[PDB]
Design a protein around this ligand. Structure first.
Ligand code: MG
Ligand code: ZN
Ligand code: ZN
Ligand code: ZN
Lengths: 84, 263, 65, 56, 33, 46, 56, 132
RNA sequence: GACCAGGAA
């Protein structure tokens, strides 16, 4: 039933899988002519556009992390650390 | 006399043993490569077959026909069919050969390269005649027949080079050696006991001074002097394989300058 | 199955030499290592070409149409 | 076990392998023949629209 | 007297034609010696 | 002038057309062959 | 057989001639592959999402 | 030639090393349906069926056969056959394959059926994935 | 297409 942001306990870093899904999802959406929130500086490959959206933390997505019990923490890709 | 030099050691219809001197090895090698791979020759390249009653399959025969050496002396005044202007081929770019054979005898009847005959017009240039070095003058035994065995086909020979198919190779093996006493140490001799005893001296050891062990190793040294031997299949006379190769290579090195210039 | 024209390895013309090698054998009663050499076959790639050839066509021939 | 946990699948290919000293570690040499059979569904987009039209 | 089916013959068995056949017989018979 | 088929064993030409029953002439056998197209085929000698 | 993670790995395509899949010699061992005639399967993703999964 | 593969001399291959003939022989017949309802070796066209192979019927003579000498390839139709109904059955060359019709053979089944075998030769030249 | 049988990195 979702955990309040001030009580979140998971890694504040982004996981290989989170990132691969984030990049993949945006690139899909970009491929489908969705709005791009970055200057494609001559870019044209939706992945690289997405890798670039991610590099500038302008991806308006949220990872909803599920706990084994069913509850969850929502994390903004804004706020996730990407030393990954 | 000038730059690189030659001395000829033996010579025949089809073998030139000689010595290159005062040259880059790379150069000596390039000539070797060119001689093998890039000197133009005529060989049968298309075979239309009207009748075949042989134990040998159409293409099996076709393939052999490509390997019969043809007179390629004046080959440079035949055009590459690719550049000639006719649709397909003409007299300007190709020689037409014809082969008809029928087992007349009871005993097995033999189809030799001698049984080819040039139908096209030669414009009187040395070309297309099958090479025959044969003692009884039959040339390559193409195929064998029994009785109702009939072979009727037609050949179109074109200009080409070994890079495209080996059938166009004017030269067979090319013997190439240097520094027969390993004085450059360009090789390290495998041995059980004595590198000297196990490894046979080359004929060319006679043509350079033995190293004499009371001597420091000459690192300054460099490979010039190369004992070569060219052997011609016959489509072109040996000497010409050497020359034309020299020429062919040169033409290449030239085309480079020429492109350098349209640049 | 019939003599190769030209040795695979080096490319020396070989298909003319067949009947000679057969004759250097039967009539001259030379042995192979000489019969081959008499035909100026020296680089062993060319030696093997003739020495180890099995001329099956001569069998194929014996069937009829 | 054989229809659900596993399946025969579309967009797949197989052939003899051989190794290359001249490929980079993470690439694979694909025969032109297979390249021509195997497809990728690309969406028409302003980014690709000309290149895409070119291939078509 | 009476017919009772057919027995497949092993080639080159006593009962097969090729048993007694000669080399040139075979070649003529379209059969590899 | 022109054949359709060839006897297998005796190899006489046999120029028959459909609905004729398949069998050689003088030769008993029933094997019969096709005889190549007059449309001369060509090969590169490579 | 595919007993490893490493038994299926993502590669960059390089379309080339001849009819073999060519691969870098050093990736030979995690596949268990030798060129004594062994064939190999190649699957091709269809979604933008799935190629991501592969490359990432 | 690393790891149980080998380098082979192209020049040698040309000169004829390791080349092979390869033959495949396709086969067919007309199957009677008791009361003389039979099939047919023939080259068919359109005509009320429309259910027939999607490659060239044109290599066929009028006996639904190819004369041996012709290049085939793809699903060229090597044999033509037909079935009635109360108006296809043709045998295309193996999709993956190609070659030259080598021998064609027209004869009878132990019954009395039109029985046919078509052989096709190809030469196979040593190429890269080939094993030795 | 079932089913049986035989042979491969
Ligand atoms: Mg293996
Ligand atoms: Zn011309
Ligand atoms: Zn040789
Ligand atoms: Zn007959």
């Amino acid at each position: 039933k979702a955990i309040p942001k001030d009580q979140r306990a998971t890694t504040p870093y982004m996981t290989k899988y989170e990132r691969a899904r984030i990049l993949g999802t945006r690139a899909l959406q970009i491929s489908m002519n969705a709005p791009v929130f970055v200057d494609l500086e001559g870019e044209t490959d939706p992945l690289r556009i997405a890798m670039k959206e991610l590099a500038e933390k302008k991806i308006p997505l949220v990872i909803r992390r599920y706990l084994p019990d069913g509850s969850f923490e929502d994390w903004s890709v804004e706020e996730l650390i990407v030393d990954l | 006399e000038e730059g690189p030099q030659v001395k000829i050691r033996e010579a025949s219809k089809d073998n030139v043993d000689f010595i290159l001197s005062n040259v880059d090895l790379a150069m000596a090698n390039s000539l070797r490569r060119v001689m093998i791979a890039e000197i133009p020759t005529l060989a049968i390249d298309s075979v239309e077959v009207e009748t075949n009653t042989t134990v040998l399959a159409d293409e099996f025969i076709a393939h052999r026909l490509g390997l019969i050496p043809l007179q390629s002396m004046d080959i440079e005044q035949l055009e590459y069919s690719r550049d000639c202007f006719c649709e397909d081929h003409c007299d300007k770019c190709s020689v037409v050969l014809t082969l008809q054979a029928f087992g007349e005898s009871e005993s097995t009847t033999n189809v030799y390269s001698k049984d080819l005959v040039i139908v096209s017009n030669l414009m009187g240039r040395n070309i297309g005649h099958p090479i025959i070095q044969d003692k009884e003058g039959n040339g390559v035994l193409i195929c064998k027949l029994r009785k109702g065995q009939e072979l009727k086909l037609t050949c179109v020979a074109k200009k080409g080079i070994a890079k495209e198919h080996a059938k166009w190779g004017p030269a067979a093996a090319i013997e190439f050696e240097y520094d027969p006493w390993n004085k450059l140490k360009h090789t390290d001799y495998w041995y059980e006991q004595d590198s000297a005893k196990e490894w046979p001296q080359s004929k060319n050891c006679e043509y350079e001074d033995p190293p004499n062990e009371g001597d420091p190793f000459d690192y300054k040294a460099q490979a010039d002097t190369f004992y070569m031997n060219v052997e011609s299949v016959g489509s072109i006379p040996v000497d010409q394989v050497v020359v034309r190769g020299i020429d062919t290579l040169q033409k290449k090195v030239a085309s480079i300058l020429l492109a350098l210039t349209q640049m | 199955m019939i003599v190769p024209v030209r040795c695979f390895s080096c490319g020396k013309v070989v298909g003319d030499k067949w009947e000679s090698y057969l004759n250097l054998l039967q009539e001259d009663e030379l042995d192979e290592g000489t019969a081959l050499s008499r035909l100026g076959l020296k680089r062993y790639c060319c030696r093997r070409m003739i020495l180890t050839h099995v001329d099956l066509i001569e069998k194929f021939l014996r069937y009829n149409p | 076990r054989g229809n659900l946990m596993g399946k025969r699948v579309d967009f797949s290919a197989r052939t003899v392998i051989s190794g290359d000293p001249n490929l980079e570690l993470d690439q694979v040499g694909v025969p032109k023949s297979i390249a021509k059979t195997l497809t990728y569904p690309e969406v028409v987009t302003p980014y690709n629209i000309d290149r895409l039209t070119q291939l078509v | 007297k009476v017919f009772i089916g057919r027995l497949p013959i092993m080639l080159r068995s006593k009962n097969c034609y090729l048993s007694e056949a000669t080399e040139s017989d075979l070649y003529k018979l379209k059969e590899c010696p | 002038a022109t054949l359709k088929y060839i006897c297998a064993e005796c190899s006489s030409k046999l120029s028959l057309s459909r609905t004729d029953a398949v069998r050689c002439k003088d030769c008993g056998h029933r094997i019969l062959l096709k005889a190549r197209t007059k449309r001369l085929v060509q090969f590169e000698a490579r | 057989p595919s007993l490893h993670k490493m038994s299926m790995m993502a590669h960059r395509v390089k379309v080339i001639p001849y009819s073999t899949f060519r691969l870098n010699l050093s990736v030979t061992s995690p596949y268990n592959a030798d060129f004594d005639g062994d064939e190999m399967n190649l699957h091709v993703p269809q979604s933008e999402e799935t190629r991501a999964e592969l490359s990432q | 030639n690393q790891e149980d593969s080998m380098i082979m001399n192209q020049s040698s291959i040309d000169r004829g090393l390791f080349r092979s003939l390869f033959f495949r022989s396709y086969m067919d017949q007309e199957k009677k349906y008791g009361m003389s309802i039979t099939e047919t070796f023939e080259k068919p066209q359109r005509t009320n069926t429309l259910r027939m192979k999607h490659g060239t019927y044109d290599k066929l003579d009028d006996d639904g056969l190819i004369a041996p000498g012709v290049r085939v390839s793809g699903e060229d139709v090597i044999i033509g056959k037909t079935t009635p109904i109360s108006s296809d059955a043709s045998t295309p060359l193996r999709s993956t394959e190609n070659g030259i019709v080598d021998q064609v053979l027209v004869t009878t089944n132990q019954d009395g059926l039109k029985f046919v075998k078509v052989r096709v030769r190809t030469t196979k030249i040593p190429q890269i994935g080939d094993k030795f």
